[PDB]
Design an enzyme around this catalytic site. Structure first.
Site, PDB file in Angstrom:
ATOM      1  N   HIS B  41      26.044  72.734  21.522  1.00 30.15           N
ATOM      2  CA  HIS B  41      27.272  72.772  22.324  1.00 30.15           C
ATOM      3  C   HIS B  41      27.387  71.635  23.346  1.00 30.15           C
ATOM      4  O   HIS B  41      28.404  71.513  24.031  1.00 30.15           O
ATOM      5  CB  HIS B  41      27.449  74.118  23.052  1.00 30.15           C
ATOM      6  CG  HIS B  41      26.723  74.209  24.359  1.00 30.15           C
ATOM      7  ND1 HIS B  41      25.393  74.543  24.457  1.00 30.15           N
ATOM      8  CD2 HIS B  41      27.141  73.966  25.624  1.00 30.15           C
ATOM      9  CE1 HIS B  41      25.020  74.505  25.725  1.00 30.15           C
ATOM     10  NE2 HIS B  41      26.062  74.155  26.452  1.00 30.15           N
ATOM     11  N   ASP B  89      22.373  77.038  18.427  1.00 29.33           N
ATOM     12  CA  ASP B  89      22.602  75.989  19.408  1.00 29.33           C
ATOM     13  C   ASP B  89      21.446  74.972  19.470  1.00 29.33           C
ATOM     14  O   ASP B  89      20.651  74.974  20.411  1.00 29.33           O
ATOM     15  CB  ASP B  89      22.804  76.632  20.780  1.00 29.33           C
ATOM     16  CG  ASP B  89      23.533  75.729  21.757  1.00 29.33           C
ATOM     17  OD1 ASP B  89      24.166  74.740  21.330  1.00 29.33           O
ATOM     18  OD2 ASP B  89      23.486  76.039  22.963  1.00 29.33           O
ATOM     19  N   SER B 185      21.266  72.885  30.064  1.00 29.78           N
ATOM     20  CA  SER B 185      21.235  73.167  28.635  1.00 29.78           C
ATOM     21  C   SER B 185      21.020  71.917  27.790  1.00 29.78           C
ATOM     22  O   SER B 185      21.529  70.845  28.101  1.00 29.78           O
ATOM     23  CB  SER B 185      22.502  73.926  28.219  1.00 29.78           C
ATOM     24  OG  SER B 185      23.635  73.468  28.932  1.00 29.78           O
TER      25      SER B 185
HETATM   26  N1  LIG Z   1      22.622  81.294  33.458  1.00 29.39           N
HETATM   27  C1  LIG Z   1      21.957  80.361  32.795  1.00 29.39           C
HETATM   28  N2  LIG Z   1      20.639  80.459  32.678  1.00 29.39           N
HETATM   29  C2  LIG Z   1      22.701  79.316  32.253  1.00 29.39           C
HETATM   30  C3  LIG Z   1      24.088  79.272  32.407  1.00 29.39           C
HETATM   31  C4  LIG Z   1      24.832  78.210  31.914  1.00 29.39           C
HETATM   32  C5  LIG Z   1      24.191  77.171  31.257  1.00 29.39           C
HETATM   33  N3  LIG Z   1      24.889  76.128  30.830  1.00 29.39           N
HETATM   34  C6  LIG Z   1      22.814  77.192  31.080  1.00 29.39           C
HETATM   35  C7  LIG Z   1      22.077  78.263  31.578  1.00 29.39           C
END
Ligand SMILES: NC(=[NH2+])c1ccc(N)cc1
Ligand SMILES: [Ca+2]
EC number: 3.4.21.22
Lengths: 57, 235
Positions: B41, B89, B185
């Protein structure tokens, strides 16, 4: 030896292929020394390791 | 990373940051001189992605940096943002010129599908990136990292009203305060095995950040070890 018993003493990976023998193996950038269980770097910088002083001293 | 700590330069040599429509919008990991692993993503069609390896302070010039351009994107074939954008992903990125490996630019270890899953079971993993340091706040100028305990499969599935597929897993705290966040991410979730780190996951998504009761979903890399090893192998 059962490759399930303490990973067969192999530092990284262990197996049993032909006569169900506990063979060891390492990951790319490492080669198995004659100690036959431990892995030794076979490249200047193998994977997964830190080589920069974490201290100035 | 909310509730994290400042990494020392060269502490996570495999870490890279991605720049495109926005700087440091995602992270990644070095598979080898020519390949990066990240989240699917993170790659929205059209945007030109720039990869920096040997990064520490995203604002200054440490002289350890290395910029590269992506000449190919290979999202996992099962990945389909139309049906779902967090399932499968994981993506591969081929660099234009090979990276020069040194103490600041070192690949992460990818183990057998079977061991990858065993190391994941050790309970603790390391997560790092230049993402938000507070839910809805500013990003990190310096790379942050955080150790996150694996969460019960039953707990994980009960924390959200969204479908958690067996391709993903939970990690983080019940208390909250410490989690990965947006901008992280694509980044690594590694497990250390006697001084040697192996990739055991990929920071994917979540609901808010560090909020109590909810966790961070990570891609279970064990179900993808082979696909990686295959398309990244050098010739
Ligand atoms: N909450 C999370 N660990 C999280 C939220 C959004 C994201 N892009 C990556 C991790
Ligand atoms: Ca820098």
């Amino acid at each position: 030896m059962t490759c399930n018993i303490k990973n067969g003493r192999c530092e990284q990976f262990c197996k049993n292929s032909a006569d169900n023998k506990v063979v060891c193996s390492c990951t790319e950038g490492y080669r198995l020394a004659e100690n036959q269980k431990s892995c030794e770097p076979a490249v200047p910088f193998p994977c997964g390791r830190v080589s920069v002083s974490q201290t100035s001293k | 990373v909310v509730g994290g700590e400042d990494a020392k330069p060269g502490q996570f040599p495999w870490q890279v940051v991605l720049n495109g429509k926005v700087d440091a919008f995602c992270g990644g990991s070095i598979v080898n001189e020519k390949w990066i692993v990240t989240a699917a993503h993170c790659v929205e069609t059209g945007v030109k992605i720039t990869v920096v390896a040997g990064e520490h302070n995203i604002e200054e010039t440490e002289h350890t940096e290395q910029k590269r351009n992506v000449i190919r994107i290979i999202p996992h074939h099962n990945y389909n943002a139309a049906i779902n954008k967090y399932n499968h992903d994981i993506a591969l990125l081929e660099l234009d010129e090979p990276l020069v490996l040194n103490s600041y630019v070192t690949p992460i270890c990818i183990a057998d599908k079977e061991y990858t899953n065993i190391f994941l079971k050790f309970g603790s993993g390391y997560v790092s990136g230049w993402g938000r340091v507070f839910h809805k706040g500013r990003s990190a100028l310096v790379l942050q990292y955080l150790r996150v305990p694996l969460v019960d499969r039953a707990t994980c599935l009960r924390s959200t009203k969204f479908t958690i597929y067996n391709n993903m897993f939970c990690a983080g705290f019940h208390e909250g305060g410490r989690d990965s966040c947006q901008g992280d991410s694509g980044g690594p979730h590694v497990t250390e095995v006697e001084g040697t780190s192996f990739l055991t996951g990929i920071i994917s998504w979540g609901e808010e950040c560090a909020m109590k009761g909810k966790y961070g979903i990570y891609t279970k890399v064990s179900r993808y070890v082979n696909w990686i090893k295959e398309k990244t192998k050098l010739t």
